[PDB]
C-alpha cells in the first residue's frame, strides 16, 4: 500500500455532544486543542465565515502537521485543501505577492455538475453534399444511426485524416478528437497501415452522463489569461461570471482552506500583503504554523517580536495552544505505529523503545522503529526483541550525541 | 465421407469470436479446451470453429463473399421503405446449417451492428426445423386449403403447360 511517514490520520474523533475522547484515530493528547480545532472545522463546514486565521502555538516537535492533516481528513475531498511550504513563496521570475494571491485563488473553488452527450463516429460518412449540410452515420457495436451536422464540425473533419475506418469523437462545443484505422482494414493480408489497432467500441449511441466536478479558480484564471492578473479587469470579470453562474443555478461555491508552514521565515513585504489581503471580504481561511519562537523578523535586523510574527500580523488571528506530553503514553503511540506496520512487537522491547523515546525525543524512537523490524526480518525473528533495539540505539546516533562527540 | 460428418455434427460448433479464439488457441500445451478424440483416435486441432467460419466469411476459398452478416443489410432495400420494419423484424433461421450451437447469438450480434437499435427485432431459432418445409406441407394439407385450388391432369391436356403459372 506504500505507507508514508505518518499514516495514523484517518479522522479526528469528535462526538455529537462536543467532548474529546482519550484515544481516537491515533491522536492521543490535547483535548483543549481538540475542541479548539473542532470549533474551526465546524466553522469551515458551516460555510458562513471567510477571512479568519489560525495559528498553532507550540514548541518544535509536537505534531501539529498531523492535526492539520486530521482537519483535512475530517473535511475530506469536498473542501479543497492545498498546503503551502514557506519556501514556495521565494520565486525568481514571479513576484511573491502574486504567488500568495494565486494561492488564495487556489483556495476558493466551485462545483457545477453538468452533462455532455457523446457521438463517437460511425466509420465512413464523408457526405459533403450541399457547404452547410453534412450527413455522418455511426456504426457502433450496438447498431447504426445517422446525424446531420452543420458545416463546421466538417471543417474540423477535413483538417484531420478522414479515411476508411476512423474514430470521430465530437463534443458539445465542436471539439473533435479523431483517430485512424479501426473496425477492419486487412484487405489483401498486406503490410502495415501504421495505425492504431483497437477492438470494437462496445456501447450504445445516446448516453446521458452526469459528473460532479470541483473546479478551482486558479485553473480558470490560467485557462482564461492565456489564449500577473489585472485587479481592475480580469478578476472582476471572473467574479461577475461566477455570480451569474450561481444566480442562474449552475455552480456551487465552497469555502477555501489553506495551511501554511514556516510563516515566520517569510519577508516583511509578504507580511504587509498578507494581513492586508486577509482583510478582504472574499479572503479564505488560512491556518498558519510558526515553528520556532522569539527571533528577528526577516528585513528588520532589530525588531524583536514573538514567534517571528509582527504585531500587525499577530493580531486578528486565533491562537491554539499545543503543549508537550507525559511519557507514560509514549509506548501507546509506538503501538499506534505497530498496528500501522503489521508486525506485532513484544512487551519488553516496547519498554526499551519507550525509554529511548523519553530519553531525548519521541521522533528518534519512531525513526528507529523501522530498522528494528528490518533487523528482525533479516535475522529471522517474528517479533522485535530487546537486543535489536538496544543495538540500534547505540549504532545510530541523534543530534545530541553527535554534538557531544 | 461419413465419420467426418459425425465429427462435424458432434465436435464442430460455432464459436463466439474468431480473433479472440485465435489468440487463446496458442500456448495450448496443457489447457484441455481444444484437443478431443473421436474414432480414427487421430487427435484434432482448432479447425472446429474455422469450418463454420466459412459460412460467416468465405475468404479462405475466394469464391464469392466474406460473410453473410452484411449481404442481408446491403440487399433488403425495397418498397418496404415504409415496409422495411416489416422486412427485417422477422428473421427465420431454418435448414441444416443452423444445427450448430452458438449460432443464434452470434448471428443476432452480427445483424445488430448494421440495423437500428429502436427497431424491435427478433431472431428466433426453433428446435424442430430439420424437415421444416415438410412441417409446412403437412400443416397446409390439414388446414383444408388444398381442395380449393387443385391443379392436375384434366387441365394439363386442355391447356398445355399454362396451368402452374397463374395459380401457383
Amino acid at each position: 500500500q506504500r505507507i508514508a511517514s505518518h499514516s495514523h490520520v484517518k479522522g479526528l474523533g469528535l462526538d455529537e455532544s462536543g467532548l474529546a475522547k482519550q484515544a481516537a484515530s491515533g491522536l492521543v493528547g490535547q483535548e483543549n486543542a481538540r475542541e479548539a480545532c473542532g470549533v474551526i472545522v465546524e466553522l469551515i463546514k458551516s460555510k458562513k465565515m471567510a477571512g479568519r486565521a489560525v495559528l498553532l502555538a507550540g514548541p518544535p516537535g509536537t505534531g501539529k502537521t498531523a492535526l492539520a492533516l486530521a482537519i483535512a481528513q475530517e473535511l475530506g475531498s469536498k473542501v479543497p485543501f492545498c498546503p503551502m511550504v514557506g519556501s514556495e513563496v521565494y520565486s525568481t521570475e514571479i513576484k511573491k505577492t502574486e504567488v500568495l494571491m494565486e494561492n488564495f485563488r487556489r483556495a476558493i473553488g466551485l462545483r457545477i455538475k453538468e452533462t455532455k452527450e457523446v457521438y463517437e463516429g460511425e466509420v465512413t460518412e464523408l457526405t459533403p453534399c450541399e457547404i452547410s449540410h453534412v450527413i455522418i452515420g455511426l456504426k457502433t457495436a450496438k447498431g447504426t444511426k445517422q446525424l446531420k451536422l452543420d458545416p463546421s464540425i466538417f471543417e474540423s473533419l477535413q483538417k484531420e485524416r478522414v479515411e476508411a475506418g476512423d474514430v470521430i469523437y465530437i463534443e458539445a462545443n465542436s471539439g473533435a478528437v479523431k483517430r485512424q484505422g479501426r473496425c477492419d482494414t486487412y484487405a489483401t493480408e498486406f503490410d502495415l497501415e501504421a495505425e492504431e489497432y483497437v477492438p470494437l467500441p462496445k456501447g450504445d449511441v445516446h448516453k446521458k452522463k452526469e459528473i460532479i466536478q470541483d473546479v478551482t479558480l486558479h485553473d480558470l484564471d490560467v485557462a482564461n489569461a492565456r489564449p500577473t492578473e489585472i485587479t481592475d479587469k480580469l478578476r472582476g470579470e471572473i467574479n461577475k461570471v461566477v455570480n451569474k453562474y450561481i444566480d442562474q443555478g449552475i455552480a456551487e461555491l465552497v469555502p477555501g482552506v489553506l495551511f501554511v508552514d514556516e510563516v515566520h521565515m517569510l519577508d516583511i513585504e509578504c507580511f504587509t500583503y498578507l494581513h492586508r489581503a486577509l482583510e478582504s471580504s472574499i479572503a479564505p481561511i488560512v491556518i498558519f504554523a510558526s515553528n520556532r519562537g522569539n527571533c528577528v523578523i526577516r528585513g528588520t535586523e532589530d525588531i524583536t517580536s514573538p514567534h517571528g510574527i509582527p504585531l500587525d500580523l499577530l493580531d486578528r488571528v486565533m491562537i491554539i495552544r499545543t503543549m508537550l506530553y507525559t511519557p507514560q503514553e509514549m509506548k501507546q503511540i509506538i503501538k499506534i505505529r505497530a498496528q500501522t506496520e503489521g508486525i506485532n512487537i513484544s512487551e519488553e522491547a516496547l519498554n526499551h523503545l519507550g525509554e529511548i523515546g523519553t530519553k531525548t525525543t519521541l521522533r528518534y524512537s519512531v525513526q528507529l522503529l523501522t530498522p528494528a523490524n528490518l533487523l528482525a526480518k533479516i535475522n529471522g525473528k517474528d517479533s522485535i526483541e530487546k537486543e535489536h533495539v538496544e543495538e540500534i540505539s547505540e549504532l545510530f546516533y541523534d543530534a545530541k550525541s553527535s554534538a557531544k562527540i | 465421407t461419413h465419420v467426418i460428418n459425425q465429427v462435424k455434427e458432434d465436435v464442430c460448433y460455432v464459436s463466439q469470436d474468431f480473433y479472440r479464439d485465435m489468440d487463446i488457441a496458442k500456448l495450448k500445451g496443457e489447457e484441455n479446451t481444444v484437443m478431443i478424440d473421436y474414432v480414427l483416435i487421430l487427435r484434432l486441432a482448432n479447425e472446429r470453429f474455422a469450418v463454420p467460419e466459412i459460412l460467416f466469411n468465405p475468404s479462405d476459398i475466394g469464391i464469392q463473399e466474406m460473410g453473410i452478416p452484411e449481404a442481408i443489410v446491403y440487399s433488403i432495400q425495397n418498397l418496404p421503405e415504409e415496409m422495411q420494419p416489416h422486412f427485417f423484424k422477422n428473421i427465420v433461421l431454418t435448414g441444416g446449417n443452423s444445427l450448430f450451437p452458438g449460432f443464434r447469438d452470434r448471428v443476432y450480434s452480427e445483424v445488430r451492428c448494421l440495423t437500428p437499435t429502436d427497431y424491435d427485432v427478433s431472431v428466433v431459432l426453433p428446435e424442430n426445423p430439420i424437415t421444416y418445409a415438410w412441417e409446412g406441407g403437412k400443416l397446409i394439407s390439414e388446414n383444408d386449403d388444398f381442395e380449393d385450388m387443385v391443379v392436375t391432369r384434366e387441365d394439363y391436356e386442355e391447356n398445355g403447360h399454362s396451368v402452374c403459372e397463374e395459380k401457383f
Binding site: N173 | D118, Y119
Partner: peptide, 30 residues
C-alpha cells in the same frame, strides 16, 4: 405495432432540437 414506434421516433426527433436550443441558450446567453 409500428405506429407507437413511429410516435416514439417523432418524440425523440422533436426532443433533440429542444436540447439543441438548450445548448444554444447555454452558449449564447452567458
Amino acid at each position: 405495432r409500428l405506429e407507437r414506434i413511429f410516435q416514439l421516433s417523432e418524440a425523440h426527433g422533436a426532443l433533440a432540437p429542444v436540447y439543441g436550443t438548450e445548448v444554444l441558450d447555454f452558449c449564447t446567453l452567458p
